[PDB]
């Protein structure tokens, strides 16, 4: 039998519902979420790491000149310095005074630390949503399996078939372009593999972690050797990967709203709480019993002994029944004023039991069913002494839930007696026209 309703998108709290079938006793249905993962689609664009500029050995032409060719290398540089006359150990290097040549070639290559700490530049495309759902009904225990959040994939959980409907909102915490460094992600823009400002983020881009091709602009410039010694001096701006690692903002896992914990290896956004989830579960007829088998109850009167405004289950009430025979029947409340802690009851012949509930109202006028029979409960509640708790609310706060009976009588005369006084004022005009008409004829 198909049960169709709307479940709010929360993880900790369960969803309680009583399934009504004509000619059959109702059953208790519990749906509880464990995980809620939003998994977008990503393609890796490029990686970034600190560079390492390695220079080859320069040549020392004694009496002559040298030229260079445009070798294929990232950020390759060449120059020619004329008239160097270098000095080494054991006297001078060459004969020809005030005419000599030094090569001083340099180019840029990635570091050996690029395989350990590198930033992965991802482009985010919208994808699929999945969840893990705990299911029980009737008398069988809790058992769970992974489900898909769409409108086309039923999942076989238990003896029933469950279709978890799509999310009400398409909100995702990820941007179009993200950067993954270590175990945290960031919302950052890219130089898009073509550009690079040589000191901010894209001074060294490689397509994969072991790609042969490498883009690198770093403002590398050759400098003249001085006073006749053999070395190749260069000048370049510092790395952009180090400058990004200092001038960095907060990661997305410290920034994302709705309590979205972010994992890494499929790049999920776990346990967000936004929107609602429609449900459709088809419970088989093997868990349905008849009206003749279940007992009937009567003479139900309810008294609330203690209620509290606080979170968790701060209310406790005892009810009195008169059952036809012993057995088990579920209890459930349709209205959202009070949730119920437990599902079933061990009934007896003319006894009484207590149950625990949870409201967000001063005066709960909630109503619950026991053994497909009706009873109502009324009472009063007191504010709690706790200021801050470490657990979320089990109830749902409404708009009229904060109105006390003293203030409700105060606003029943400012809108009731005043608006009816204008009615008293308006009928005086309606009767003075009748008297003035009767003066004529």
């Amino acid at each position: 039998y198909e049960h169709t309703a709307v479940m709010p998108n929360k993880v900790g709290i369960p969803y309680k519902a009583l399934v009504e079938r004509p000619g059959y006793a109702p059953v208790h249905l519990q749906i509880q979420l464990v995980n809620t993962r939003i998994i977008p689609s990503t393609n890796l664009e490029y990686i970034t790491c600190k560079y390492k500029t390695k220079v080859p050995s320069p040549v020392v032409k004694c009496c002559g000149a040298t030229q260079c060719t445009s070798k294929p290398h990232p950020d390759y540089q060449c120059q020619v310095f004329s008239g160097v006359y270098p000095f080494m150990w054991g006297g001078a290097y060459c004969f020809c005074d005030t005419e000599n040549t030094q090569m001083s070639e340099a180019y840029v290559e990635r570091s050996e630390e690029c395989s350990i700490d590198h930033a992965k530049a991802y482009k985010v495309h919208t994808g699929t949503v999945q969840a893990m759902v705990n299911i029980t009904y009737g008398s069988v225990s809790w058992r769970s399996a992974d489900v898909y959040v769409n409108g086309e994939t039923p999942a076989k959980i238990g003896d029933a078939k469950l279709i978890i409907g799509p999310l009400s909102s398409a909100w995702s915490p990820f941007d179009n372009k993200v950067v993954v460094y270590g175990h945290e992600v960031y919302n950052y823009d890219f130089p898009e593999y073509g550009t690079g400002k040589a000191g901010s983020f894209g001074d060294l881009q490689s397509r994969t972690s072991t790609s042969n091709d490498l883009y690198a602009n770093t403002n590398l410039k050759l400098q003249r050797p001085q006073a006749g010694i053999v070395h190749t001096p260069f000048t370049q701006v510092p790395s952009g990967f180090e400058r990004w690692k200092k001038d960095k903002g907060a990661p997305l896992n410290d920034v994302a709203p709705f309590g979205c914990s972010i994992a890494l290896e499929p790049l999920r956004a776990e346990n967000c709480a936004v929107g609602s989830i429609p449900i459709s579960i088809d419970i088989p007829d093997a868990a349905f019993t008849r009206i003749s088998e279940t007992p009937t109850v009567s003479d139900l009167e309810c008294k609330i002994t203690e209620c509290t405004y606080a979170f968790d289950f701060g209310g406790i009430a005892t009810v009195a029944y008169k059952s036809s025979k012993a057995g088990n029947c579920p209890i459930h409340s349709p209205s959202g004023v009070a949730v119920i802690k437990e599902n079933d009851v061990t009934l007896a012949e003319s006894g009484s039991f207590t149950f625990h509930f949870s409201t967000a109202n001063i005066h709960p006028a909630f109503k619950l069913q026991v053994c497909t029979s009706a009873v109502t409960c009324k009472g009063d509640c007191k504010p709690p002494k706790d200021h801050i708790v470490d657990y979320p609310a089990q109830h749902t706060e409404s708009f009229t839930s904060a109105i006390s009976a003293t203030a409700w009588s105060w606003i029943k005369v400012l809108v009731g007696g005043t608006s009816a006084f204008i009615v008293l004022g308006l009928i005086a005009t309606a009767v003075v026209a009748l008297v003035l008409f009767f003066h004529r004829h």
């Binding site: 410290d254 920034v255 709203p257 708790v389 657990y391």
Partner: protein
């Protein structure tokens, strides 16, 4: 292996969380709210200070140093009596609802 900061002294108020932080090293404190607006704050603490954060019913999550994050939710304790004279009925709803009692009156 990294240092662990001493735990803060936590005292509660009405929709207000107070932390007494006493660091011996420059320590990072990041907070965020679990509602629609995250409102993220971050600062480095080098001296013994005290900070106040407005915790609502949706919640608040704060991390201090290398400690795991903690989540706290504010209850509805209130500062008034809802039944009685209207000089104390109004002051009960002013603390609970300061945005509707001024407009509604």
């Amino acid at each position: 292996i990294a240092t662990l900061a001493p735990e803060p002294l936590v005292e509660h108020k009405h929709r207000t969380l107070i932390l007494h932080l006493h660091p011996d090293h420059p320590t990072l404190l990041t907070t965020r709210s679990l509602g629609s607006d995250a409102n993220p704050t971050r600062q480095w603490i080098e001296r013994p200070t005290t900070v106040n954060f407005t915790v609502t019913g949706e919640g608040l999550e704060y991390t201090w140093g290398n400690h795991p994050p903690k989540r706290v939710w504010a209850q509805e304790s209130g500062e008034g009596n809802p039944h009685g004279w209207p000089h104390e009925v109004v002051v009960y709803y002013y603390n609970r609802y300061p945005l509707t009692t001024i407009i509604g009156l």
